[PDB]
């Protein structure tokens, strides 16, 4: 596998997540896939998102299946008591994910919140010309505040620009596409005033999908995870 991803900054030495290639072969978990670890379970050894699917709830909004995971879960070991609260979305048919995590979810105020994306880059190529993407975004998801918008990619010029809006929040991104590794990086702007950065990745043949995070250091409430599939 060729797993790539990123998470916004950790806020605590134990209450945090990190993304990367999954390492756990045990229970429902399989190594070698797009994964996440939490500091409260085996010092964040990562497990695969795919395996979490059959145990996660679903809230579908505007055609986006937001997956939700938190204790209690039948068959989860006691070591998992402090796993926290995950909201995450599978992007397309491949092993591509974006989402957020917090200690206590909506009921507790999304403490220790982080955003992330992670996916398998195997087989990724970039097409010629231009394409647009229907993108969804998550920031403290409560069931009715999903962000949505359109990103515009110009692969000939190496630009990715777009915006997401929802639940009173607007995030715009302006990034440069790196054709050597199909990543992108640039600025992010929240509600037209708050400066941050964007980092993300195209996945799949002919850039079938993308995922990324927009983060705002010193203004972290606006941190947003996003992803979507190419239009057509």
| Residues at the site binding ligand HEB, with contacts judged by CB under 6 A | 24, 26-29, 36-38, 41-42, 45, 47, 52, 55, 69, 73, 75-77, 80, 83, 86
- Residue 71 vs 205, nearer CB to ligand HEB: 71
- Taking residue 214's Cβ as centre, other Cβ atoms within 10 Å add up to 28
Q: How many CB atoms lie within 10 A of CB 131?
A: 21
For the CB of residue 37, give the shortest distance to ligand HEB in the complex, in Å: 5
Q: Which is nearer to ligand HEB, 9 or 77 (CB)?
A: 77
Least CB distance from residue 98 to ligand HEB, whole Å? 15
Consult the annotation and say whether 42 binds a ligand: yes
Alpha carbons 198 and 220: distance in angstroms, whole number: 13
Select 120 or 198, whichever has its Cβ closest to ligand HEB: 120
Q: Which residue is nearest to ligand HEB (CB)?
A: 27
Query: How far apart (Å, rounded) are the C-alpha atoms in residues 228 and 116?
Result: 14
Q: What's 28-47 look like in SS3?
A: CECCCCEEEEECCCHHHCCE
Task: Measure the CA–CA gap between 21 and 184, rounded to whole angstroms.
Answer: 20
Contacts of 58 (CB under 8 A, 6+ apart): 65, 66, 67, 68
Q: What is the smallest separation between the CB atom of 45 and ligand HEB, expressed in angstroms?
A: 4
- State which residue, 28 or 167, has the beta carbon closest to ligand HEB: 28
Binding site as annotated, residues for heme: 42, 80
């Amino acid at each position: 596998a060729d797993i790539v991803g990123a998470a916004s900054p950790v806020t605590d030495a134990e209450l945090y997540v990190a993304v990367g290639e999954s390492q756990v072969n045990g229970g429902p978990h399989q190594a070698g896939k797009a994964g996440i670890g939490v500091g409260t379970v085996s010092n964040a050894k990562p497990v695969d998102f795919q395996g979490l699917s059959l145990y996660s709830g679903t809230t579908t909004v505007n055609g986006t299946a937001v997956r939700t995971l938190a204790m209690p879960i039948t068959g989860a070991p006691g070591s998992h008591a402090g796993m926290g609260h995950f909201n995450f979305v599978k992007v397309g048919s491949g092993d591509v994910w974006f989402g957020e995590w917090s200690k206590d979810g909506a009921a507790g105020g999304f403490n220790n919140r982080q955003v992330y994306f992670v996916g398998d880059r195997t087989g990724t190529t970039l097409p010629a010309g231009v394409a647009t993407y229907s993108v969804a975004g998550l920031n403290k998801f409560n069931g009715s505040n999903l962000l949505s918008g359109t990103f515009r990619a110009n692969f000939g010029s190496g630009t990715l620009q777009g915006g997401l809006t929802g639940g009173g929040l607007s995030v715009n991104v302006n990034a440069s596409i790196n054709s050597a590794n199909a990543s992108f990086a640039g600025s992010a702007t929240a509600n037209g005033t708050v400066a941050g950065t964007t980092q993300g990745q195209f996945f799949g043949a002919n850039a079938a999908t993308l995922a990324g995070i927009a983060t705002f250091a010193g203004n972290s409430q606006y941190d947003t995870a996003f992803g979507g599939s190419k239009n057509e």
